[PDB]
Write an enzyme that holds these catalytic residues in place. Sequence first.
Site, PDB file in Angstrom:
ATOM      1  N   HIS B  41      51.319  47.086  33.788  1.00  0.00           N
ATOM      2  CA  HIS B  41      50.955  48.110  34.920  1.00  0.00           C
ATOM      3  C   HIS B  41      51.843  48.004  36.081  1.00  0.00           C
ATOM      4  CE1 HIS B  41      48.506  45.435  37.051  1.00  0.00           C
ATOM      5  NE2 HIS B  41      47.398  45.165  36.041  1.00  0.00           N
ATOM      6  N   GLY B 143      46.873  41.626  44.236  1.00  0.00           N
ATOM      7  CA  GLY B 143      48.078  40.772  44.143  1.00  0.00           C
ATOM      8  C   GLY B 143      48.121  39.801  43.103  1.00  0.00           C
ATOM      9  N   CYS B 145      47.438  39.728  39.779  1.00  0.00           N
ATOM     10  CA  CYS B 145      47.875  40.157  38.648  1.00  0.00           C
ATOM     11  C   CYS B 145      49.059  39.420  38.061  1.00  0.00           C
ATOM     12  CB  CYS B 145      47.938  41.800  38.359  1.00  0.00           C
ATOM     13  SG  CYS B 145      46.619  42.316  38.209  1.00  0.00           S
TER      14      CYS B 145
END
Lengths: 306, 306
Positions: B41, B143, B145
């Site tokens: 993503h 932030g 991920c």
Amino acid sequence: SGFRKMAFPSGKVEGCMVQVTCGTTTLNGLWLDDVVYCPRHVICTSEDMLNPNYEDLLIRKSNHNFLVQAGNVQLRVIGHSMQNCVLKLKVDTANPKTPKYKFVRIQPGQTFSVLACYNGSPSGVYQCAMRPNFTIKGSFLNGSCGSVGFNIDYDCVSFCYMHHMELPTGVHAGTDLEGNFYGPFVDRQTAQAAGTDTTITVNVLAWLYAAVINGDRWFLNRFTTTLNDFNLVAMKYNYEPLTQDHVDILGPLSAQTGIAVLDMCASLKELLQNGMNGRTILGSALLEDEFTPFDVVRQCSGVTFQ
Amino acid sequence: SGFRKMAFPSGKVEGCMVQVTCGTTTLNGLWLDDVVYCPRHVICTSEDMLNPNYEDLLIRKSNHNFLVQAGNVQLRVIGHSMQNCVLKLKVDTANPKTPKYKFVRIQPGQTFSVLACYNGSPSGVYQCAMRPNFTIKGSFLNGSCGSVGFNIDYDCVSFCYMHHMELPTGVHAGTDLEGNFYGPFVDRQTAQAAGTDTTITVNVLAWLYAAVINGDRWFLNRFTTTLNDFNLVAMKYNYEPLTQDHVDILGPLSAQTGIAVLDMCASLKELLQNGMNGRTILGSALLEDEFTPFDVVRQCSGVTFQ
Ligand SMILES: *C(=N)[C@H](C[C@@H]1CCNC1=O)NC(=O)[C@@H]1[C@@H]2[C@H](CN1C(=O)[C@@H](NC(=O)NC1(CS(=O)(=O)C(C)(C)C)CCCCC1)C(C)(C)C)C2(C)C
Ligand SMILES: *C(=N)[C@H](C[C@@H]1CCNC1=O)NC(=O)[C@@H]1[C@@H]2[C@H](CN1C(=O)[C@@H](NC(=O)NC1(CS(=O)(=O)C(C)(C)C)CCCCC1)C(C)(C)C)C2(C)C
């Protein structure tokens, strides 16, 4: 979101751990530049521990009585001395992995990460607080002496704890990195007892703020209180007194949530007097006091390290 | 003695974390040999997230649309592909710090350490369990991920989790390192809900054994029970059923304490039916289910890693 008991990343400390052997005793050492730090009781035999005379015991040793291993490599000991309750072993090789570091003597209520080690090798990392009675509630087995406690501050490792002994109640005592014990303990096998422990009030309040930040609000109320009325209730439940310095430390959390410190104190007062009645806060059924205001900010604002 | 929520040492993973930027989105990547793994993503814009077509979005990108930083150094992206829900970025430089590693898809009830990261830099390490409903109760902010979960097995890092998203209840969902989600989730911003969670029975029993090993014995009794009577009570309280495999896994702890698994089950049955009545076990007022039998052995027998 979420809230966990979070330790600092341990990589910078892992590369400083070594194994130290003297006689039949092996424990861990901290290797920084060309010095290896370890508990001085590594020089004791079984006979010495009831009442060692460490100056006598050390003068009877030579450099070759100390075996220092960094993984497979042996480090040659070229000098030794004693500072308070640590031993300093000068070696022929400076650790190429020495981080930027400082030594700091912390105060009760502060938290730090422990890197538990056996035979020079890291077993695990966990967070704990220096209790008001100068013990820590750690997790340590035979061979763990010399494991260190630390914080990370930007790029700098601050070492604040070296492990020396376990008390009969199952809690732990040790020194700063200059060898001074926290608390009234000494490194000999005589009956010694810790003072009574108290609950770290300012940390409980920080954790109630973390709960609000994470959406757990059931304990809030419209009341307010004064420092003086709060401290009267707190002392009755074995909580540390709250000072103005504590209130100012809680500033950034009060601002971020819009709940004044003395409003949060009124909620805590109610929780002390009525209990939690089978509700939980942040997944706990007890009030948690091993997070500082700074731990909460760091974890609820995302601070990183270099 | 003592018992803490203990994470693995993180050094070997810290040197694999990088920062990945595509467009205005920055998150973390895992750099092993010459490949950088990150959530796919990262290629989405705000418009794409309700219903992205990832094959379309990726074909519109070129190698130079991906900025990969390892500290100050930039890594040149020479190829890209997608495997399930991860992106694989081939770079011109193989990480010199690649540990021995493997990728493992874990099962519910297993535990692992999470190294939480922002902008490629480690913020903290904590332990958590894969819940029966395939979420984890983590601590993650914007932030985060691309932060990974791992275990260490001797000298080998086993990666089992990469972080992708937070659910509206505040818990977290992600994939294995081959990009397959744990659970029924997909990486798009549509309403998705986790199944109901249950308590991991075999872990609760392991933790009651840790309590006995540490001297907390008040909950023991002389009774015994059968698997069938135990499971009937367990299902009533939203506990996972106990199997014979579970009983055999608890073997080494039963042996070390001399309390048979089915005797310990009778104690747990009583705790479920009567509650703990304001007593604590290992410092907790709730029954704790995020320690596996192996976590207990490791921490109560002192296992280290190379
Ligand atoms: C370091 N490798 C090791 C770590 C401990 C092993 C188990 N968990 C620990 O943290 N520590 C020591 O070997 C330390 C060195 C000797 C003996 N030590 C102990 O920790 C022991 N405890 C102990 O003697 N504690 C005191 C005395 S007592 O327990 O009241 C007794 C009844 C008189 C024995 C002495 C220190 C202050 C507190 C009380 C033990 C855990 C191994 C039994 C030395 C203290 C020098
Ligand atoms: C990674 N850097 C980041 C980490 C999260 C930030 C806060 N804590 C986290 O763990 N994750 C994402 O950016 C992730 C990417 C978009 C949006 N993402 C979210 O985590 C968001 N949640 C979310 O959309 N969840 C679902 C939809 S919902 O919340 O029910 C809503 C009401 C429709 C918005 C979709 C995934 C499954 C669960 C429900 C949020 C935390 C940023 C709001 C993508 C999912 C691709």
